[PDB]
Amino acid sequence: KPIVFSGAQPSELTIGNYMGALRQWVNMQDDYHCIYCIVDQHAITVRQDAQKLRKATLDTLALYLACGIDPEKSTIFVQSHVPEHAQLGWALNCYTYFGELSRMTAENINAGLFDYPVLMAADILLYQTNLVPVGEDQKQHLELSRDIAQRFNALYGEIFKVPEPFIPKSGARVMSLLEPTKKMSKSDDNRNNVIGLLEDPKSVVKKIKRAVTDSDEPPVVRYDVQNKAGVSNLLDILSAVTGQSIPELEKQFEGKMYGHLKGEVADAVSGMLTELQERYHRFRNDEAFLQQVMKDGAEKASAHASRTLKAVYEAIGFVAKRH
Amino acid sequence: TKPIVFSGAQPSGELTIGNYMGALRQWVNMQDDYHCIYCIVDQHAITVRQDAQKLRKATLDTLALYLACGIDPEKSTIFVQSHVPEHAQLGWALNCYTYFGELSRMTQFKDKSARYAENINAGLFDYPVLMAADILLYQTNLVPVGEDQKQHLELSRDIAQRFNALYGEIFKVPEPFIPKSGARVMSLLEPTKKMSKSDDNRNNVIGLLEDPKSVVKKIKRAVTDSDEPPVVRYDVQNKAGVSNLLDILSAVTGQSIPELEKQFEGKMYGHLKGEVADAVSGMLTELQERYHRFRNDEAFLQQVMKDGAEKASAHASRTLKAVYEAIGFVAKR
Ligand SMILES: Nc1ncnc2c1ncn2[C@@H]1O[C@H](COP(=O)(O)OC(=O)[C@@H](N)Cc2c[nH]c3ccccc23)[C@@H](O)[C@H]1O
Numbered sequence: 194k195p196i197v198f199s200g201a202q203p204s205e206l207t208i209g210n211y212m213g214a215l216r217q218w219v220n221m222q223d224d225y226h227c228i229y230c231i232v233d234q235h236a237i238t239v240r241q242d243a244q245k246l247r248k249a250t251l252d253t254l255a256l257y258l259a260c261g262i263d264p265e266k267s268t269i270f271v272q273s274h275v276p277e278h279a280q281l282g283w284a285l286n287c288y289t290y291f292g293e294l295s296r297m298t299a300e301n302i303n304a305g306l307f308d309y310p311v312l313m314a315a316d317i318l319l320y321q322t323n324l325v326p327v328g329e330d331q332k333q334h335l336e337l338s339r340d341i342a343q344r345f346n347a348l349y350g351e352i353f354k355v356p357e358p359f360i361p362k363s364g365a366r367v368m369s370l371l372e373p374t375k376k377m378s379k380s381d382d383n384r385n386n387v388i389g390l391l392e393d394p395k396s397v398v399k400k401i402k403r404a405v406t407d408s409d410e411p412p413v414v415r416y417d418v419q420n421k422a423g424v425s426n427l428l429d430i431l432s433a434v435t436g437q438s439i440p441e442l443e444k445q446f447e448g449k450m451y452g453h454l455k456g457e458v459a460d461a462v463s464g465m466l467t468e469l470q471e472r473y474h475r476f477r478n479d480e481a482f483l484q485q486v487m488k489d490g491a492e493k494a495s496a497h498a499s500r501t502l503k504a505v506y507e508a509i510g511f512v513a514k515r516h
Numbered sequence: 517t518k519p520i521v522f523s524g525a526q527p528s529g530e531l532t533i534g535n536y537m538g539a540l541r542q543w544v545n546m547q548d549d550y551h552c553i554y555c556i557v558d559q560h561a562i563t564v565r566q567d568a569q570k571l572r573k574a575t576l577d578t579l580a581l582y583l584a585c586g587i588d589p590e591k592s593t594i595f596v597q598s599h600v601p602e603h604a605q606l607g608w609a610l611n612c613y614t615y616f617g618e619l620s621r622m623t624q625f626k627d628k629s630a631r632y633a634e635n636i637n638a639g640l641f642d643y644p645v646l647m648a649a650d651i652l653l654y655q656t657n658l659v660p661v662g663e664d665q666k667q668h669l670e671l672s673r674d675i676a677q678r679f680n681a682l683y684g685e686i687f688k689v690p691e692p693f694i695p696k697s698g699a700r701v702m703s704l705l706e707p708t709k710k711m712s713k714s715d716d717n718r719n720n721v722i723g724l725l726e727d728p729k730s731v732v733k734k735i736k737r738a739v740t741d742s743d744e745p746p747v748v749r750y751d752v753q754n755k756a757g758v759s760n761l762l763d764i765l766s767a768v769t770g771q772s773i774p775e776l777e778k779q780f781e782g783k784m785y786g787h788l789k790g791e792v793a794d795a796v797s798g799m800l801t802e803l804q805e806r807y808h809r810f811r812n813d814e815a816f817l818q819q820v821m822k823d824g825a826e827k828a829s830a831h832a833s834r835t836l837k838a839v840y841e842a843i844g845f846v847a848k849r
Pocket residue numbers: 522523524525526527533534535536537538539557560646647650651659660661662663664665698699700701702710711712713
């Protein structure tokens with residue numbers, strides 16, 4: 194099976210993240226050898242509270258498990274638990290141009306923020322990764338990892354796989370509630386633009402009722418991204434939850450106002466989130482379960498990572514460690 | 517417990533009398549007085565592009581040379597840097613508490629970048645952070661180095677203090693131990709330039725594993741000055757070559773420069789060079805005699821690397837545990 198590497202930040206998922214990327218990938222765990230790395234060494238490139246970082250790491254783990262990531266099928270682990278990432282990160286620094294890092298898309302910036310694309314390259318290249326499902330803002334980073342891999346391979350032979358981006362997209366388009374032109378993003382400042390995965394039904398109703406629509410008279414529930422962006426987003430959200438087609442929903446809401454739509458959207462979304470939240474809290478509060486998932490995952494990751502790093506170290510010419 | 521000494525040298529190029537006087541001499545002298553840990557920094561070496569066979573051989577050459585100088589594996593911890601993962605682990609973590617401007621301003625990065633314009637790599641830029649990690653892992657009190665590493669060591673103090681201010685008494689703040697003589701041995705044909713272990717012009721350098729007869733010839737041809745009459749006196753500005761020779765002689769014999777100046781009263785550069793050649797040739801003969809006994813004994817070198825990496829890992833893992841707990845990582849099971 195092809196190896197898929199996905200990096201997960203320990204810092205709050207939305208329905209866009211879930212119904213888009215994550216739900217798609219939960220259903221492909223038997224098609225691919227999927228690896229999920231909670232990237233706590235990348236997280237510290239921004240200064241943050243220590244106790245919140247620890248909490249956020251475990252929050253992220255439980256939520257990925259809640260979404261359906263199966264630790265017996267896929268490998269899920271915490272980045273800092275596998276030393277090989279930092280080890281390969283340093284080695285690949287020596288085969289990465291300073292220019293390449295400076296050209297990524299002043300003197301008080303920390304070196305971690307400057308140097309993390311190399312660590313990212315190491316994260317991917319450690320596991321002989323075939324595919325990486327990056328977003329558009331990390332396409333440049335993946336490309337650097339491909340360039341590093343080909344450069345190293347040209348000097349020393351075929352040590353690394355040249356990874357590819359995962360090209361086909363989720364299916365669910367999920368846009369911001371007060372800005373339906375812009376995509377719903379976990380990193381949005383405006384909280385009223387997003388529905389978080391742990392939001393309660395009262396919070397969901399409030400945010401959906403405030404969601405922007407249009408001034409059509411009569412109000413008409415019809416799909417039109419150009420002219421009716423807000424109503425179209427509500428339709429896409431509802432379709433993504435229920436599996437009902439757009440033309441089916443258009444018929445279902447014939448002669449109905451935007452209030453009825455919003456009510457059904459809120460009910461559908463919160464119906465979905467109640468099942469995920471049940472799973473989330475059950476997993477998250479079970480310390481022994483989470484510890485065993487992390488230990489098992491780190492063990493699997495380390496077995497593969499050590500194999501690659503040993504070949505890298507042999508190629509460079511380092512004297513092999515005496516065990 | 518004793519205060520801790522940490523220092524390192526690269527298995528790249530060929531170690532010189534400069535590397536010896538600035539660093540290795542002090543390493544040997546500190547072994548009983550302090551708890552000493554000495555590293556072959558192969559991960560730093562590859563910031564300049566190395567042939568793979570040369571790197572491996574040079575790592576083992578350097579190890580054997582530590583032993584030849586008098587570094588005793590019963591007294592000191594001797595290990596190869598890449599054998600202890602914690603160096604790279606703390607190296608990454610400390611990037612996040614190091615500013616970009618602190619690294620771009622470094623003299624060594626600037627010198628090496630001008631020299632290797634075809635390979636100005638991220639490792640060469642990030643060099644000081646990994647070096648800080650090397651030191652800070654072992655709760656280091658003293659770092660014996662030459663003058664050229666003072667800037668790097670100052671940053672490691674800054675990183676230690678900056679991290680400690682946020683998180684508590686995680687690191688010791690290390691101090692430089694730079695010698696009075698031989699802290700910056702200069703090139704024989706260009707005494708305003710530091711002696712390099714990778715000089716294109718071999719006549720500039722006195723190599724630790726070089727034929728003593730070849731070394732004597734190079735000392736004889738070392739540039740001096742046009743002073744009339746020739747006078748053996750210390751003056752770095754106007755008599756760089758003579759001063760450098762006096763410095764080398766002071767560091768080998770343990771005699772002060774004022775003492776040497778008095779000794780060479782009424783003498784000229786023939787006496788100076790004769791005395792420098794005698795002392796250095798004697799030193800290298802003894803050193804190289806010991807070197808081959810160690811270097812050709814693979815079982816012994818293998819055992820030193822095994823025991824050393826074990827000792828180092830015990831200390832390094834303890835520090836990294838505390839660093840990881842402080843910054844807020846979920847602790848490994
Ligand atoms: N011409 C000279 N005269 C006097 N001393 C000199 C001369 N040239 C070099 N030195 C000193 O030799 C030591 C090793 O130098 P390296 O370039 O191998 O290697 C270096 O310059 C270090 N970055 C290696 C290192 C890596 N991590 C560390 C942690 C602590 C101490 C040292 C290290 C150094 O002490 C250096 O000051």
